[PDB]
Structures are given as structure tokens and as C-alpha cells.
Design an enzyme around this catalytic site. Structure first.
Site, PDB file in Angstrom:
ATOM      1  N   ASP A   1     -51.740  42.443 -24.985  1.00 55.09           N
ATOM      2  CA  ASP A   1     -51.512  43.609 -24.141  1.00 55.09           C
ATOM      3  C   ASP A   1     -51.114  43.149 -22.718  1.00 55.09           C
ATOM      4  OD1 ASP A   1     -51.442  46.403 -24.031  1.00 55.09           O
ATOM      5  OD2 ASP A   1     -53.436  46.601 -23.210  1.00 55.09           O
TER       6      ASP A   1
ATOM      7  N   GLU B   1     -46.851  43.682 -25.448  1.00 58.98           N
ATOM      8  CA  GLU B   1     -46.603  45.078 -25.038  1.00 58.98           C
ATOM      9  C   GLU B   1     -45.174  45.449 -24.582  1.00 58.98           C
ATOM     10  OE1 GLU B   1     -49.132  46.604 -21.954  1.00 58.98           O
ATOM     11  OE2 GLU B   1     -48.723  48.692 -22.447  1.00 58.98           O
TER      12      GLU B   1
END
Ligand SMILES: [Mn+2]
Ligand SMILES: [Mn+2]
Ligand SMILES: [Mn+2]
Ligand SMILES: [Mn+2]
Length: 1178
Positions: A449, A482
Site C-alpha cells: 500500500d 497501490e
């Protein structure tokens, strides 16, 4: 002087005085230049040093290899180095590798990545011109690519090389030159960051590895390609100012590959060079499995709730397998760790115990792989929480003032991680090793992420990203991340590329023809159809992953929509990825105006409209063609796909942004297994059919099917292959009738059902009722006069009506060990719904709910109140029993409804788990005597409480807080509240002030308060301010203004105590809970993040104790007199439903034949409570 290296494809003349090529001569005599001028520049640490004859020694090792030793010295600039360079050739490739760097000014990097004085940090060969083309050559041209996440801004450039071309170290991710019948790209492992077209983040988006420079070469202008600089021993600084030197990710490497007319289209341009370039380019680790990954999605857990335990995710894998006839899957486990998503960062090795821990995670992955499902986990290397064991002063990112670099507050306050420290100290790699010890070789990928958004430092550059990806790939894990533009070098998926809804048109996947031509088959990192973004997102011919979800991510739970989307966009996208692009012409995105005048317009291909040709290694050919290049034409969104010249798809895809249904139909030959993607038995080849509008279409079958006289067609549903039809083949053609947006699979002959054993490892077969109506005869046993049905077209549930029992034997229990069994239940009936564990007809444990009173507000959970269990709503809540597995190994669970009502009870998700909770004590008859809970053994959630509606359906800011001293305790930084009061766990509420509504509550199925019985309730708490939270007591479904509230005083950093008494309401539906008042917190002059981290707005509860107490014994007469007294007070009012109801019920207790002192005492106490209520009644 020079020497020659030789292969079967070319001879290369190289210089002895420098690792330089003079020229490449191909077998057919065509020539490409290298560095025609005397250029001997070496850059170290930004200083250019020109080498003389005595600075270089040369050795021809063989016909394929030469070695150079370079003395590179500049005393003034503290450079004294010896660089060894290897040149090798094979086929049409030349490689140039720096095989050794000796620093005469250093003994190397000191222990612990200390600073190396005089480190050789960067190295390059300025204007090395390893390949070049000239203005004097026929069709001399350059094509380059840079990163663009903007659908309206192409990353590419295409221009003729003319005498006016003038360029110096112009940098590109990819660079190709063509001229005089040859084309070449240059590859390098350089971590240099440079020029980009569009990117919202860093994190490797900016990696530019090729430098283009012009020079005069006799009367012509020569454009040469060189590698961008490499990092060797780079010196870096962390957020506290501490310096480190860190060794190279890899030694410097670069290469070229010389192409002729590789796609045989009669022109030589970058596309020929690009085909050859695939033979030398880096390939992301495990990029070969990307085309198998048809079904991506996220399975989410959050806030201690265990919405999706690992064995449930396995069952949902099997459901998807049935509905796709076994296509591969890629399941991203968001919240696999600690208490769920955005808890526990960055303890990569802490696998969520409430989900089943490493054991169930491994079972899920091992069994899931048999259905071609890959799994990966969401990790964060930029932000951390106090609860994480890795949380430390050295891990904390600090600002220049020395204060914390705060992240986001939600369950807890996130704090930035010092990214440079985390790398240089070896801390991050050690946490990935922790995770490797848990998963072994079972896990497919890491999802990193946020990386690139500058939360961990102001850099997060390609060098850091390369090291990050390497520590991940070294553990056998495929890299994914991400942001759409991030990590060009190593990532095989970007969440913001594959989920097209995020970020808007400036912030998507890689908008480059060069990048996608090269790597479409290796990544889900492109621009898919999402026409409101325009440009690249208006019906890309190659399609592009369109990701949806059904397991709780952002509330997403629509399974049918998930499957429809797979067939709409993802099956064809993945079909296309089984081929590599060989030609791409008439691209409407590229114009003279945007720097792409030399892109090809071939009016003899597809009417001068866009077309892409792709091939596999077996010479199969796919051709994808745009109806028109004019965006105002209906035909711009028309696409034809042919496979070996035969039409396999035609029409307009339903808009990827949900805005307009299309008309595309297809009959796609799915020739590959869902594993390594090898060809399946000629006899198990199949075709997928889809018809967007529905109707009848006619198709030419592939060549190997042409002599069949019939085919078998199955409609695919969540139960697998259904409704077999035998369809005649006539002259190699079939006609198919299809419902709209309904998947079919076509075989040459009769096909067997994919075998599915529901709920492996779960102690019961089909715990989630996924086995269709058949599951109630094959797996569960139904009895009684009532009715049992599998109900719901989405997440299927058990539905009970009337007097009915549904039971199943439990398997695989450890005799003598303690288990919790919990099941989701939503009871709309006034009659009780029960769960019971028996052994040999004897009851081990049992529990019941009357009409459900608390709606479900858990966003990541599959039956929350936005999912319509019945009527507008869902009251699903988990109902528990606790038992010890019997020595005789004979245990049975029964789910039942008692009353002869016409109303429904819903059950789902029978979960049997080892669990050591033993805080419930019963009375002789089985009613509640006491319930205690330190929250140290919660199977999931905040049991015996359930989350209420103060945030609506949300990833609720309420969960089990975890001890990690001193960081979780009052007094660390600006923290003033302890997260945990006793033991390791408490119940925490973060920041839910001024809601003026209920925050959480017990419910009867969790804690039943008998009518008229009296109970003492106590708990320890901390609360950030006076009167911001209150004790609530109510009966039945919460309603504003029909609860008793008691404000709690501040207990901030010191634990307070609460206790009160309650008397069970007459309908058995009493409950207590915690309520957020209208009162503002006292922030004690704190500002910024301190306001949140301080704990002024928080509430922590622990050591709950609920116990039946003795009430003053009453005679019948006293009870009768209390009725008279109450009626004397309130019968003359009316200026009432509750009143009459409580009164009738009290009189029943009083007047029953055989009533006892307990009956009279209950009746009296009920009326005293009625009195208190009535004093403040509407
Ligand atoms: Mn060509
Ligand atoms: Mn279910
Ligand atoms: Mn505790
Ligand atoms: Mn927490």
C-alpha cells in the site's frame, strides 16, 4: 585498434581502448553504428573523467566476450577507482556489465551500513552511444517512452532523426532507434529517476534508464543511446539526520538487441526493436502467471470483527471457481494481519489470530491453489501504530523540529515510518522474513500500500523501490502496489490501475503505447475502459483489468455484479494477455501535435483505423481492430477480435464506468490451464460465450473443432455447469442462443462437474450455505413441521420458517479441548431461534435469540444492514455457544426455530473455533448467573457487545485495542489515555464524541436479562472527558429518548470504575451499552494531531462483570399492592403501550397457579422499574 566478437547473427567490432562498439554487422550485411567518435568519459559521483590509453587494459576472452580494466582517477575530487567491464554477445544481443568496482580510497562499508568515506555512489558512461543512428540514414528515427498516469497525455514520443535533432542526456524509461533497416532499444538496470509526463507519486514512477545524446559524425547528426547512471554504494540520511552507506541492489548492467524487420511488415521502426528488446529486458518476478489471473478481488477484515476468516475465503474461492469454470484467481487479503486492515502495521509476520492464524491461512492457500487461486497480503511500509511490536523510537519518522510525523487517526493514531532507517537498519527485511517463516512457499504476492506518496520520507525513489521490490521477490513473492504510475520496474499490478473508479483521469495506469506493446502480457498496470476519462480509457483495444469485489472492501458485497464484470471486461483482457504484441498501427492517441509525428499511419491496415496484432510462441495470431478512429463515430467503441483469422469477439463493451450497456458478444477459445498456463488436452479445450444484450449469434469454431458434429454448452452459475444443451455443428459453425449477460462454456463433448467439498477444515460441510438447495439434503439434516430453505441470490443464507431443526455432525474436533461455535443470526420472528451443540442426545451448550433488536453496521461484513436480508435491512449478529469437545467424538450442531409463526429466521456462517473463553456461569435452569469478560479470549468482535449505528454502516472506529508498552500507554508522546486497562486487550472507541446516539450495546442473544430479575453490571473504563460518553440502558431496538443515560466522568490515564443495577424488562429484551452524548470534549488546549492522539475523545472499557443479584423477597400481597400503587399513579394519566404491557405481564407473574416468592419478587421489581420509567415517559 579493435577486435571482433561474433555470433551466428552478427559480428561486432569493439574498441580496445574503451568498452565501446564501433558497429554491429548483421549476417545479411546491414550495419548499425555504436560510438564512432573517440569518447572515453567515465562519470563517478558526478565528476566526468576522460580516460587515456594508459588508463585501460583489454582482453579478448573468446569470440563472445571481452574484458576491460579501467583506471578512473581524479585526486582533486577524491576519486580513485578501478572498474572492470565485460562485453558479451549472443545471437543479436550485446551485453555490457560492470563486473567489479574497486575503490582505492576505501575499505568498504563499515558494519551496520555505516558511512563509507569516498564511496563510489554513482557511475555512468556519458555519451557512450552503445547504439546510434544518423540523419544520413534512411528512415532514421527515435521513439521514447516516459511515465504517464494521465489518460489524456500519452507517455510516448516518435520523431525522425534529422540534421536539426539536438539532444543531451534526454532521459526515457525506454528508448528505441531505427535507421538503414535496423532497430535497437537499450536496456539498463539503472535506478535513475528523471523526466515524466504525468504521475501523482514517486515510488519508482520516474525511473528513466536510457539517455539520448546527439553528436556530429562527419557531415551527419548521430543520435546515440547510453545507460542512465547507476547507483553503487549510495550514501543516505534518515529523518533524525543519521547517515548510512548501503550496497548496490545489483551491479551495473545494460544491453542492446539488434532487430531487422522482425514483424515482417515492410518497415523498420521501434516495433521491430521492441520485439527484440523482450529478449534482453528485465521481466517482473512471476510476471509469467499474470494472464492466468482472471479473478482479482479483495477479501477484507477490519476492527477485530473477522468478517472474512481464511477458511471462509477458501469457500468463496470455490464459489468463484464454479461460476468461472475454474479460471485463475488472485485474492488480495486486506486485513490478513493483527486485528485487520490498518491494524498492526508494520508487523508483517503477525497473521490475524481471529481469522484462524497462519494455520488456516496456509490451508486456504494450499487448497486454493488447486482451483488456480493465488493469495497475497496487504502490507504498509510507510505508517505504523503503537500496538505493533516493531513500533520503536528508531522506526518513528520525525520532522525537522523533532516532532512525530503523524499519519491518519481512525482505530488508533498512525505514525510515519522512517523509510531510510527501515531500509538501512535491516529492520524491514527482517519483518518480511517473519512473514516468510509463517507462509513458507505458499503465498503468491505482496500488495504494498501507499508507497510513493512520501509518507515514509521525501524520496521513496526508484532506488528505494528497487530494494523494496527485491526483498519481497527474494521471498518468492510477486510484487504489486497501490498507485497507477508506481514501480515501473518490478510491479505486476497497480490497484489504482485495475480499479478504474479511483483517482480520476490524471491518476490511472500507464498510458504508453511503447510500455504496453512491450509488457501488456506481464502486468495489470494499464488503462482499461472507463470512457468518462476519455483518451486512453475510451475502449482501449487491449481492454484492461476492471476490478470489482464482493468480500467487504469499501462495503462491496454484490457477488452477481462481480461475476458479470469479470465476463464483461476481464475474460477478454486476460485472453489477450496470452499473446505478445507484434504490431500496432494507426493509434488515434498519437499525433504530430503531441510529439508523435513519426507514429505509423497505415491506410492499408483496417481502413487506416487502429489495429494491434499479437502472437504467441506457437504462432497463433490475434488481431484486434477498432471500427473507427473518430471518437464521435459509433464505431470508435466497436472492436473485432480474430484468432487465427476467425472472428471470436465483436461489438461494443458495456462502459467500464457503469454508464451504458454495450452489445459485445464473444466465443473465446480458452486453451490454457489455470496453473502455469500450458495447453490443456485437445479433448478438454473449451470456449467461453457471452452475449451482452442476449439473443442468437452464429460463430465459426476454431480449426481443431471444424469436423465435430455437435458441441456441449453449459450455463455457468454459482453451482457450476448447468442446463447442458447439445448444439449441432454445421460446416464448422455453431449457432448459440444466450440470455443477456449470462456466461456459457462450450465443450467438444460431455463435461464433468468441478468437484467441490464445501467448508474444508471448518468442522462442518457447507458452513456458508453455498451448496444450493441440495445442501439441505446432502450436508445438513432438516426435521420438523416447518420449512428450511437456502435463500438469497447474493451471499446465500439458511432461512427457517415455523418449527424446524437443521443439524449436522461436527468433524475433526480435538476431544477435551474448548471450542466456541458462533453463527450469524437475523430473527424476524417473535419465537426463539437457537443454536445447540449435542453429544449422544445430551445438550453440551445452547443459546437463543428472540426477535433481533440490533441492526448490523459492519461495512466489511457480508450481511450488514445495507445488504437487504429482509425488508429494508439486516439484523445479523453472531450468536455464540461455548463447549468442550466430547471424549467420544460425537458432537452435532443444530440450528432451529421453535415458534409456529410465519416470520423468518436467517442463519449463515457456522463457525467452530478453538477458544478458551469460560466467563459465563448459568443458574440451575439455564438462565444467566454471571458473565465476566476481560476480552482476552474474544473469538471475534467486541462480544458480548455489538457495534451500533453511530457512524452508520462503516469500518467502525471501535475495536479490540492491544498492549504494547510504553507506546500504547498514557505518557508516551502526547498520549494521555491507556489503550489497554488489563491484560493484553480492551474494547476501544476512538473519537466518537458528539454523536448523540448509541455506540455499542449488549443484545439478548449475547447476554439475556430475565424479566424482573436483577443484575449488577460493572466495568473498568477510561474516558477522555467528562460527560462525553454515558451508560445506556434500554429494552428492545434502540430509539432516541427511550433509554436511561448515565454520564461517565473523565478517567484519563487512570482507570475508573462503573457499576449500576438493572432489572430485566418484561419482554426479555433488556440491554446496556455505551452512548455518545451531545457534550463536547475538553481538548485541554491540545492542537493538531494531539487532539486525536491525546485521547480526550476516546473511550476504553475492560473487565466487564454482569451478575444476577438477590433482590428483597416480596410476598404476593406486596406485589399486588405495588400494582395498585402504580395504577393509582398513572391510570388517571393518558395526557401507554409500555405501561399496559408491563402491567399485564406483572399480573401474570402474580396470578399464575403455583406462583412462588421468585415470581412475586420479579413482579414487584418489574413494577418498580416501570415506576422509574413512567416518571419521565413521553
Ligand atoms: Mn517492421
Ligand atoms: Mn453464506
Ligand atoms: Mn483485558
Ligand atoms: Mn488498535
Amino acid at each position: 585498434a579493435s577486435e571482433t566478437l561474433k555470433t551466428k547473427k552478427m559480428e561486432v567490432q569493439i574498441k580496445k581502448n574503451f568498452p565501446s562498439v564501433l558497429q554491429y554487422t548483421m549476417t545479411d550485411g546491414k550495419v548499425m553504428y555504436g560510438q564512432s567518435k573517440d569518447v572515453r568519459t567515465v562519470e563517478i559521483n558526478g565528476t566526468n573523467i576522460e580516460l587515456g590509453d594508459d588508463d585501460v587494459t583489454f582482453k579478448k576472452v573468446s569470440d563472445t566476450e571481452a574484458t576491460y580494466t579501467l583506471k578512473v582517477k581524479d585526486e582533486a575530487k577524491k576519486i580513485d577507482a578501478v572498474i572492470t567491464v565485460q562485453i558479451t554477445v549472443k545471437a543479436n544481443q550485446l551485453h555490457l556489465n560492470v563486473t567489479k568496482i574497486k575503490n582505492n580510497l576505501s575499505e568498504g562499508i563499515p558494519e551496520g551500513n555505516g558511512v563509507e568515506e569516498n564511496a563510489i555512489q554513482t557511475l555512468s558512461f556519458p555519451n557512450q552511444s552503445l547504439v546510434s543512428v544518423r540523419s544520413s540514414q534512411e528512415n532514421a528515427q527515435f521513439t521514447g517512452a516516459r511515465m504517464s498516469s494521465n489518460t489524456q497525455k500519452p507517455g510516448d514520443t516518435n520523431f525522425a532523426v534529422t540534421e536539426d535533432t539536438n539532444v543531451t542526456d534526454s532521459d526515457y524509461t525506454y528508448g528505441f532507434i531505427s535507421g538503414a533497416g535496423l532497430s535497437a532499444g537499450l536496456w539498463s538496470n539503472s535506478e535513475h529517476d528523471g523526466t515524466y509526463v504525468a504521475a501523482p507519486v514517486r515510488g519508482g514512477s520516474q525511473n528513466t534508464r536510457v539517455y539520448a545524446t546527439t553528436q556530429q559524425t562527419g557531415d551527419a547528426t548521430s543520435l546515440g543511446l547510453a545507460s542512465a547512471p547507476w547507483y553503487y554504494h549510495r550514501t543516505v540520511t534518515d529523518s533524525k539526520g543519521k547517515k548510512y552507506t548501503v550496497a548496490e541492489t545489483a551491479l551495473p548492467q545494460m544491453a542492446v538487441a539488434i532487430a531487422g524487420d522482425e514483424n515482417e511488415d515492410g518497415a523498420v521502426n521501434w516495433q521491430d526493436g521492441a520485439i527484440a528488446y523482450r529478449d534482453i529486458m528485465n521481466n517482473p518476478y512471476k510476471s509469467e502467471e499474470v494472464p492466468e489471473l482472471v479473478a482479482w478481488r479483495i477479501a477484507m477484515n477490519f476492527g477485530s470483527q473477522a468478517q472474512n476468516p481464511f477458511l471462509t475465503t477458501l469457500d468463496n474461492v470455490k464459489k468463484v471457481a464454479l461460476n468461472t469454470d475454474g479460471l485463475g484467481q488472485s485474492v488480495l487479503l486486506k486485513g490478513y494481519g493483527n486485528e485487520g486492515h490498518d491494524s498492526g502495521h508494520p508487523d508483517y509476520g503477525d497473521i490475524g489470530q481471529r481469522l484462524g492464524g497462519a494455520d488456516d491461512m496456509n490451508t486456504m492457500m494450499e487448497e486454493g491453489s488447486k482451483y488456480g487461486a493465488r493469495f497475497g497480503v496487504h502490507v504498509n511500509a510507510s505508517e505504523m501504530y503503537p500496538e505493533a511490536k516493531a513500533f520503536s523510537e528508531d522506526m518513528v519518522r520525525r520532522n525537522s523540529a523533532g516532532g512525530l510525523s503523524y499519519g491518519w487517526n481512525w482505530l488508533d493514531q498512525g505514525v510515519g515510518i522512517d523509510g531510510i532507517y527501515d531500509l538501512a537498519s535491516g529492520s524491514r527485511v527482517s519483518r518480511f522474513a517473519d512473514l516468510s517463516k509463517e507462509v513458507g512457499d505458499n503465498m503468491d504476492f505482496i500488495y504494498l500500500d501507499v508507497w510513493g506518496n512520501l509518507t515514509s520520507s521525501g524520496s521513496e525513489d526508484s532506488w528505494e523501490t528497487r530494494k523494496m521490490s527485491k526483498m519481497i521477490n527474494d521471498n518468492g513473492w510477486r510484487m504489486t502496489t497501490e498507485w497507477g504510475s508506481g514501480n515501473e520496474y518490478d510491479s505486476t499490478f497497480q490497484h489504482w490501475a485495475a480499479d478504474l473508479t479511483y483517482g480520476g483521469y490524471t491518476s490511472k495506469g500507464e498510458n504508453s503505447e511503447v510500455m504496453r506493446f512491450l509488457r501488456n502480457h506481464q502486468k495489470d498496470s494499464w488503462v482499461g475502459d472507463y470512457p468518462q476519462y476519455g483518451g486512453a480509457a475510451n475502449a482501449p483495444l487491449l481492454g484492461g483489468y476492471n476490478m470489482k469485489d464482493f468480500e467487504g472492501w469499501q462495503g462491496r458485497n454484490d457477488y452477481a455484479a462481480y461475476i458479470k464484470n469479470l465476463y464483461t471486461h476481464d475474460v477478454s483482457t486476460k485472453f489477450i494477455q496470452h499473446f505478445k504484441v507484434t504490431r500496432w498501427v494507426n493509434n488515434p492517441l498519437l499525433t504530430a501535435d503531441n510529439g508523435n509525428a513519426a507514429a505509423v499511419s497505415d491506410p492499408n491496415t483496417n481502413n487506416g483505423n487502429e489495429q494491434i496484432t499479437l502472437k504467441d510462441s506457437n504462432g497463433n495470431v490475434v488481431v484486434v481492430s477498432r471500427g473507427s478512429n473518430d471518437t464521435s463515430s459509433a464505431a470508435y467503441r466497436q472492436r473485432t477480435i480474430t484468432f487465427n483469422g476467425v472472428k471470436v469477439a465483436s461489438g461494443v463493451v458495456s462502459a467500464g464506468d457503469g454508464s451504458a450497456t454495450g452489445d459485445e458478444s464473444y466465443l473465446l477459445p480458452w486453451m490454457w490451464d489455470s496453473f502455469t498456463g500450458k495447453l490443456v488436452k485437445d479433448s478438454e479445450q473449451k470456449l467461453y460465450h457471452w452475449n451482452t444484450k442476449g439473443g442468437t449469434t452464429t460463430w465459426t469454431l476454431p480449426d481443431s473443432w471444424k469436423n465435430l458434429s455437435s458441441v456441449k454448452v453449459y450455463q455457468l452459475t454459482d453451482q457450476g455447469k448447468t442446463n447442458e444443451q447439445t448444439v449441432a455443428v454445421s460446416g464448422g459453425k455453431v449457432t448459440l442462443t444466450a440470455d443477456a449477460e449470462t456466461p456459457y462454456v462450450v465443450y467438444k463433448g460431455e463435461a464433468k462437474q468441478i468437484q467441490v467439498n464445501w467448508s474444508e477444515g471448518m468442522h462442518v460441510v457447507d458452513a456458508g450455505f453455498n451448496g444450493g438447495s441440495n445442501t439441505l439434503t446432502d450436508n445438513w439434516t432438516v426435521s420438523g413441521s416447518g420449512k428450511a430453505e437456502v435463500e438469497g441470490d447474493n451471499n446465500a443464507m439458511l432461512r427457517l420458517t415455523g418449527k424446524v431443526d437443521v443439524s449436522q455432525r461436527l468433524t475433526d474436533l480435538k476431544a477435551g479441548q474448548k471450542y466456541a461455535l458462533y453463527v450469524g443470526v437475523d430473527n424476524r420472528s417473535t419465537g426463539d431461534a437457537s443454536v445447540t451443540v449435542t453429544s449422544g442426545g445430551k445438550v453440551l451448550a445452547t443459546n437463543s435469540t428472540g426477535k433481533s433488536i440490533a441492526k448490523n453496521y459492519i461495512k466489511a461484513y457480508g450481511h450488514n444492514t445495507n445488504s437487504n436480508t429482509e425488508n429494508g435491512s439486516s439484523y445479523f449478529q453472531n450468536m455464540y455457544v461455548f463447549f468442550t469437545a466430547p471424549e467420544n467424538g460425537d458432537a452435532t450442531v443444530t440450528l432451529s426455530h421453535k415458534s409456529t409463526d410465519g416470520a423468518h429466521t436467517y442463519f449463515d456462517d457456522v463457525r467452530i473455533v478453538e477458544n478458551q473463553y469460560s466467563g459465563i456461569t448459568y443458574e440451575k435452569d439455564g438462565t444467566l448467573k454471571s458473565l465476566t469478560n476481560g476480552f482476552e479470549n474474544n473469538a471475534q468482535g467486541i462480544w458480548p457487545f455489538v457495534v451500533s449505528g453511530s457512524e452508520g454502516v462503516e469500518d467502525n472506529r471501535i475495536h479490540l485495542s492491544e498492549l504494547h508498552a510504553p507506546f500504547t500507554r498514557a505518557g508516551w508522546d502526547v498520549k494521555k489515555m491507556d489503550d489497554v486497562l488489563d491484560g493484553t486487550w480492551s474494547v476501544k472507541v476512538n473519537g466518537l464524541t458528539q454523536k448523540g446516539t448509541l455506540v455499542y450495546q449488549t443484545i439478548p442473544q449475547n447476554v439475556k436479562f430475565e424479566a424482573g430479575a436483577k443484575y449488577k453490571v460493572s466495568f473498568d473504563y477510561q474516558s477522555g472527558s467528562d460527560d462525553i460518553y454515558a451508560i445506556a440502558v434500554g429494552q428492545g431496538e434502540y430509539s432516541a429518548g427511550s433509554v436511561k443515560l448515565t454520564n461517565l466522568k473523565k478517567a484519563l490515564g487512570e482507570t475508573g470504575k462503573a457499576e449500576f443495577e438493572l432489572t430485566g424488562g418484561v419482554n426479555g429484551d433488556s440491554w446496556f451499552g455505551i452512548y455518545s452524548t451531545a457534550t463536547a470534549p475538553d481538548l485541554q488546549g491540545s492542537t493538531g494531531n494531539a487532539q486525536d492522539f491525546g485521547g480526550y475523545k476516546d473511550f476504553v472499557l475492560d473487565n466487564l462483570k454482569i451478575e444476577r443479584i438477590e433482590s428483597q423477597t416480596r410476598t404476593k400481597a406486596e406485589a399486588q399492592d405495588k400494582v395498585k400503587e402504580i395504577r393509582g399513579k398513572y391510570d388517571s394519566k393518558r395526557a401507554w403501550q409500555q405501561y399496559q404491557d408491563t402491567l399485564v405481564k406483572a399480573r401474570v407473574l402474580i396470578n399464575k397457579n403455583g406462583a412462588t416468592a421468585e415470581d412475586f419478587t420479579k413482579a414487584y421489581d418489574i413494577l418498580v422499574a416501570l415506576d422509574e420509567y413512567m416518571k419521565t415517559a413521553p
